[PDB]
Amino acid sequence: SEESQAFQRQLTALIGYDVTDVSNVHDDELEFTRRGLVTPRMAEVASRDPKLYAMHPWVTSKPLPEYLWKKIANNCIFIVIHRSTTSQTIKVSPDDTPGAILQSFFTKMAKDFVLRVCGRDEYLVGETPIKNFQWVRHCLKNGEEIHVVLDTPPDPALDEVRKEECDRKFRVKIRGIDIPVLPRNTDLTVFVEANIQHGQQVLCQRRTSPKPFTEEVLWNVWLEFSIKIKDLPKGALLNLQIYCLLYYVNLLLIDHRFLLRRGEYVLHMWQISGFNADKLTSATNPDKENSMSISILLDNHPIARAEMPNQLRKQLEAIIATDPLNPLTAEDKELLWHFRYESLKHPKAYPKLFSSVKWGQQEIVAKTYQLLARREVWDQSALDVGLTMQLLDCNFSDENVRAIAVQKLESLEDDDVLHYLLQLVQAVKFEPYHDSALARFLLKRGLRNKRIGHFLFWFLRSEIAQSRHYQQRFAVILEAYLRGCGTAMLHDFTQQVQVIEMLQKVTLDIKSLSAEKYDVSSQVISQLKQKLENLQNSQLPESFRVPYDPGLKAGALAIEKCKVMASKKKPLWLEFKCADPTALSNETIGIIFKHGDDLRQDMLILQILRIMESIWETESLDLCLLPYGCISTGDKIGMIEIVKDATTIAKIQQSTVGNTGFKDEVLNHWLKEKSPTEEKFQAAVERFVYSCAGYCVATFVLGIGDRHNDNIMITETGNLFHIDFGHERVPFVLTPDFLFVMGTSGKKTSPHFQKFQDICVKAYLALRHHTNLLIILFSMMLMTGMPQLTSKEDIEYIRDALTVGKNEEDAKKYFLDQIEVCRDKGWTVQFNWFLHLVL
Ligand SMILES: CC(=O)/N=c1/[nH]c(C)c(-c2ccc(Cl)c(S(=O)(=O)NCCO)c2)s1
């Protein structure tokens, strides 16, 4: 077809990669995966209810936390419905349905339709209490009145999807290596290391003889491995590495058709920088010109209970109780394996059990499959996301193991998917094959719910733009999604892509008008405005969805308010009009636009923050973190949400006291001067003690607590919040000025500080109840979000931070010391940031 080719060229520009391309291939897994994904796509497309799809009610089935019940002291809730300008308030009970409110309106007042929130593409529809809508719980928590317009359901037809119509030792022959341009050092020796890998576990290892490092090195050696051919498990990687460690590539021993991989290969390798997820990719380097290569030959068809004593059961259960980062001894492993059936009765044993498996042994693998045949206990246990994530990490390369984890995820309501989506997407980096239960799960869930669908797009596009290690895989997944999201969403994405391309192609030019002499002259700010007013007319779209808040529709630029800012990089501060006529307020949408940092680390941190909040919700705690919108759109560059009416703490202090200097009161004065009534001031000191506590606990746990005061902000209403997670010591930032607000000054105790301490201990202990989930997220963040990181140095930090294996009193004691360490030195580390600027 011809109207199918434009559509392909449409999808390419949306994706940022061309998936028809075959240049960087050596087999057909990608195309196979495109074809494979058609079925599950169409199964979810055919399945979804058009009506509920179009309106995508954002809904939860969690209870309602104690601290928001207190905010409805009457079993009634106030909703204000509108038409033109005609408006009326309605008495509603928490258990009322959108259905039970329409008649409480129509049958109540006379002189079909649906309830949409003012200023947003967000709806209150479907069989759910209003108390179980997200927009409603937000309105409460924020002290805000719910505002909603009456109009029609949006036409489901707008979401019309288009139309698609042996038994011997294994051997590998190393021929040679070659880099087109060598020049680097008195080149040491150089050898090839050939690992047979499965789940980061090396099953077998052979090397070449060491030879000189010229731009062409040879061997012609057959390397014989200890493993037999029938002993190879599906998912096994031939991992080929160059030491002198500087280069790596991987080739799957068994392909997507269960065939043993045979023949000649010329593989272009990746270079080490200066363990992590990049080291695992089946993708070869596409830069065939600059990159080191390797040549190999494969010639080698398809794939082929009683009662336990006492003290051992104790020993077993000790092992099972232990944390995800506890090393399993050989003794521990054999214990688990020999008593696998007894181990199978404990859903928590599963990770340690399945890493007690000798995957290099064919007959044991089989027994493990038989073992997985009786899933009774597993299938009936409640969802433990933490358990499930463990099975999706770099430690498991077996499809059956991985699929039981994907099975458990099915029972997640879309609310919870949204919480774990970034990390489920990053977990895709740990899949041996392009077609996985996990990729498909993301596809299904993505297409069933537009909100998920939106974030799935941006999450995948972030990686496609930024890493060659996985861009091909993620691109095939993105195409699968785009092919079913609907014409309405395709148009939307198109809008959004245009805008950010246009806007980034302005962040560049501007940044190069001063390298390090930051000082934004009139010559700079004016030409910025000239670009935008040029853009406004005949290129920049009418209205785009705010990528980090798909609810809000942004309209026209407000040129006058735009700027560059004092930052040592040069980020755009941009403000937009809302395109929604019904918008309750006339306030602008602020979006920062920043080039120079890798925003994916900021994404991973923010999202764990949201997780940490919901974790706290489970125990009726609120720490009012402000996890600001932040989306990585392209390479080294992406957008951020402007929190209105906030300023940096350092910037606050550089208004009263010189520049090099500090002083302790200025925070509290700044608060009193920006809050009108001394009550709204107390509402601010309130907000401060909670927000402060939260960022202290969260921050310590992730070991990102030692920050320079310019990296912490506060709102005009008391809410403190860390920013720019782009990358002697202090556990967190609790400085004298903070303490001054709490009614304390250098080594004493006060009622707000007594509270502060109290809420901290309570917040900490709460996270400790979810220890395992946090350990796995952290290490996955480390493996999929950074350069190189250590498998017991970087990660093993969080065991200690969360104080694994302690009684609550120890834990509380431990944390309260950290509070006191910050006390000792108060301004010490702070001052140092400026001292280093000369040492
Ligand atoms: C009014 C105001 O300053 N609002 C803001 N709110 C937020 C969350 C801001 C923010 C958040 C993150 C980042 Cl990364 C930045 S930034 O201006 O790009 N970086 C400055 C380095 O410290 C600014 S700026």
Short mmCIF file of C-alpha atoms in Angstrom, two decimals, residues 478-677:
data_model
loop_
_atom_site.label_atom_id
_atom_site.label_comp_id
_atom_site.label_asym_id
_atom_site.label_seq_id
_atom_site.Cartn_x
_atom_site.Cartn_y
_atom_site.Cartn_z
CA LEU A 478 7.20 1.77 20.83
CA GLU A 479 6.03 1.02 17.27
CA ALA A 480 3.86 -1.79 18.58
CA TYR A 481 2.23 0.66 21.00
CA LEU A 482 1.82 3.51 18.52
CA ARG A 483 0.06 1.16 16.10
CA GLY A 484 -2.89 0.82 18.51
CA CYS A 485 -3.04 3.90 20.74
CA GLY A 486 -5.43 5.63 18.32
CA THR A 487 -5.40 8.43 15.72
CA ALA A 488 -6.23 10.95 18.47
CA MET A 489 -3.13 10.04 20.45
CA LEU A 490 -0.90 9.88 17.35
CA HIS A 491 -1.90 13.45 16.49
CA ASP A 492 -1.20 14.42 20.09
CA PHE A 493 2.24 12.84 20.18
CA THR A 494 2.94 14.55 16.83
CA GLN A 495 2.01 17.91 18.41
CA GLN A 496 4.26 17.24 21.39
CA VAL A 497 7.20 16.06 19.28
CA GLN A 498 7.03 19.17 17.04
CA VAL A 499 7.01 21.52 20.01
CA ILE A 500 10.00 19.98 21.83
CA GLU A 501 12.08 19.64 18.64
CA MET A 502 11.41 23.30 17.84
CA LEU A 503 12.20 24.32 21.43
CA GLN A 504 15.41 22.30 21.91
CA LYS A 505 16.68 23.79 18.64
CA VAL A 506 16.67 27.05 20.60
CA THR A 507 18.23 25.81 23.86
CA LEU A 508 21.36 24.97 21.83
CA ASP A 509 21.98 28.27 20.02
CA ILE A 510 21.34 30.24 23.21
CA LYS A 511 23.68 28.09 25.35
CA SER A 512 26.66 28.86 23.09
CA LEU A 513 26.38 32.66 23.58
CA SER A 514 28.42 32.37 26.82
CA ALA A 515 30.36 29.25 27.86
CA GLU A 516 31.15 29.80 31.56
CA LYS A 517 30.82 33.56 32.05
CA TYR A 518 27.22 33.26 33.25
CA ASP A 519 25.62 36.67 33.21
CA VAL A 520 22.58 37.04 31.00
CA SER A 521 22.94 40.33 29.10
CA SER A 522 20.14 42.25 27.32
CA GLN A 523 21.73 41.06 24.05
CA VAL A 524 20.87 37.52 25.22
CA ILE A 525 17.32 37.87 26.66
CA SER A 526 16.00 39.94 23.74
CA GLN A 527 17.13 37.61 20.92
CA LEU A 528 15.51 34.76 22.89
CA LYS A 529 12.21 36.62 22.70
CA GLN A 530 12.74 37.33 18.99
CA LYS A 531 13.05 33.57 18.29
CA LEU A 532 9.84 32.71 20.18
CA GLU A 533 7.66 35.42 18.56
CA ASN A 534 8.95 34.20 15.21
CA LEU A 535 8.09 30.61 16.22
CA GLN A 536 4.64 31.64 17.48
CA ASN A 537 3.20 32.48 14.04
CA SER A 538 3.72 29.82 11.37
CA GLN A 539 5.56 26.82 12.87
CA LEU A 540 4.73 26.19 16.55
CA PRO A 541 1.43 24.20 16.96
CA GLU A 542 -1.81 25.60 18.37
CA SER A 543 -1.91 23.42 21.47
CA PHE A 544 0.16 20.60 22.92
CA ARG A 545 -0.29 18.19 25.82
CA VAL A 546 2.15 18.93 28.62
CA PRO A 547 4.29 15.75 28.40
CA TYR A 548 4.79 15.47 32.19
CA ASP A 549 1.11 16.20 32.96
CA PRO A 550 -1.00 14.83 30.06
CA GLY A 551 -4.05 16.47 31.66
CA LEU A 552 -2.98 20.06 30.93
CA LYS A 553 -3.23 21.36 27.36
CA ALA A 554 -0.74 24.19 26.72
CA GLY A 555 -1.59 26.92 24.21
CA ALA A 556 0.30 30.03 23.11
CA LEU A 557 3.65 31.18 24.46
CA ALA A 558 3.64 34.17 26.77
CA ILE A 559 6.78 35.65 25.23
CA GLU A 560 7.27 38.47 27.78
CA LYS A 561 7.68 36.03 30.69
CA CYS A 562 10.26 33.74 29.05
CA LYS A 563 13.96 33.92 30.01
CA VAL A 564 17.30 32.18 30.36
CA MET A 565 18.52 31.79 33.96
CA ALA A 566 21.72 32.26 35.98
CA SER A 567 22.46 28.49 35.85
CA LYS A 568 25.99 27.47 34.73
CA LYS A 569 24.26 25.64 31.90
CA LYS A 570 21.64 27.79 30.16
CA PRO A 571 18.10 26.49 30.67
CA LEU A 572 15.02 28.16 29.19
CA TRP A 573 12.32 29.33 31.57
CA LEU A 574 9.12 29.23 29.54
CA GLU A 575 5.51 30.06 30.33
CA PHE A 576 2.47 28.99 28.34
CA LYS A 577 -1.16 29.97 28.14
CA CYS A 578 -3.68 27.21 28.71
CA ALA A 579 -5.59 26.26 25.56
CA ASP A 580 -8.67 25.17 27.56
CA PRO A 581 -11.31 27.94 27.54
CA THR A 582 -12.93 26.46 30.66
CA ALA A 583 -9.67 26.72 32.63
CA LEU A 584 -10.71 27.68 36.19
CA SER A 585 -7.68 29.98 36.47
CA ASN A 586 -5.83 32.30 34.10
CA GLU A 587 -2.45 31.23 35.55
CA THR A 588 0.36 30.23 33.16
CA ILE A 589 2.03 26.86 32.65
CA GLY A 590 5.70 27.02 33.52
CA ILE A 591 8.15 24.60 31.92
CA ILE A 592 11.94 24.67 32.21
CA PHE A 593 13.96 23.48 29.20
CA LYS A 594 17.43 22.19 29.97
CA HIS A 595 20.45 21.01 27.96
CA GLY A 596 23.62 19.62 29.55
CA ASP A 597 22.52 16.97 32.04
CA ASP A 598 21.25 13.42 31.56
CA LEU A 599 17.66 13.73 32.83
CA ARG A 600 17.10 9.99 33.20
CA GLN A 601 18.80 9.91 36.57
CA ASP A 602 16.40 12.68 37.60
CA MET A 603 13.46 10.64 36.33
CA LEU A 604 14.49 7.54 38.26
CA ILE A 605 14.94 9.53 41.50
CA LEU A 606 11.64 11.45 41.22
CA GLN A 607 9.70 8.25 40.55
CA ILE A 608 11.13 6.45 43.56
CA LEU A 609 9.98 9.55 45.48
CA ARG A 610 6.42 8.97 44.32
CA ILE A 611 6.71 5.32 45.24
CA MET A 612 8.00 6.38 48.66
CA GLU A 613 4.96 8.59 49.10
CA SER A 614 2.42 5.90 48.23
CA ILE A 615 4.38 3.62 50.54
CA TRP A 616 3.74 6.19 53.24
CA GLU A 617 0.07 6.46 52.27
CA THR A 618 -0.37 2.77 53.18
CA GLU A 619 0.27 3.88 56.79
CA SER A 620 -1.77 7.11 56.63
CA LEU A 621 1.33 9.31 56.45
CA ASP A 622 1.78 12.40 54.31
CA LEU A 623 5.14 14.12 53.93
CA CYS A 624 4.02 16.41 51.10
CA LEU A 625 7.07 15.83 48.96
CA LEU A 626 6.99 17.80 45.74
CA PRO A 627 8.10 15.29 43.05
CA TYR A 628 8.09 17.84 40.26
CA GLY A 629 7.37 16.86 36.65
CA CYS A 630 10.53 15.96 34.76
CA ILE A 631 10.73 14.22 31.38
CA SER A 632 13.78 13.29 29.36
CA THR A 633 12.80 14.07 25.77
CA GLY A 634 16.05 13.60 23.86
CA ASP A 635 19.81 13.49 24.09
CA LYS A 636 21.29 15.23 27.17
CA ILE A 637 18.20 17.42 27.11
CA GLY A 638 14.56 17.53 28.27
CA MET A 639 11.90 19.34 30.25
CA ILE A 640 10.96 20.13 33.85
CA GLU A 641 7.90 21.47 35.65
CA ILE A 642 8.06 24.93 37.17
CA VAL A 643 6.81 24.93 40.72
CA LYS A 644 5.30 28.40 41.01
CA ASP A 645 6.31 30.67 43.90
CA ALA A 646 9.42 28.79 44.99
CA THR A 647 13.03 29.89 45.53
CA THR A 648 16.33 28.31 46.38
CA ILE A 649 17.43 28.43 50.03
CA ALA A 650 20.86 29.78 49.04
CA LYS A 651 19.20 32.45 46.87
CA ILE A 652 17.03 33.31 49.90
CA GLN A 653 20.21 33.82 51.96
CA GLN A 654 21.90 35.97 49.31
CA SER A 655 19.30 38.73 49.87
CA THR A 656 20.13 39.76 53.47
CA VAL A 657 23.70 38.43 54.02
CA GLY A 658 26.61 39.24 51.61
CA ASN A 659 27.69 36.38 49.34
CA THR A 660 30.55 34.36 50.84
CA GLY A 661 28.88 34.46 54.28
CA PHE A 662 25.76 32.44 56.85
CA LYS A 663 22.85 33.64 59.01
CA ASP A 664 20.09 31.62 60.65
CA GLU A 665 16.87 33.71 60.79
CA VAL A 666 16.42 34.71 57.14
CA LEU A 667 14.32 31.62 56.35
CA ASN A 668 11.68 32.39 58.95
CA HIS A 669 11.57 36.09 58.00
CA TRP A 670 11.16 35.21 54.33
CA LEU A 671 8.26 32.96 55.31
CA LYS A 672 6.48 35.50 57.51
CA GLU A 673 6.89 38.16 54.79
CA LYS A 674 5.40 35.97 52.03
CA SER A 675 2.50 34.56 54.11
CA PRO A 676 -0.20 37.22 54.79
CA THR A 677 -1.95 35.96 57.95
#
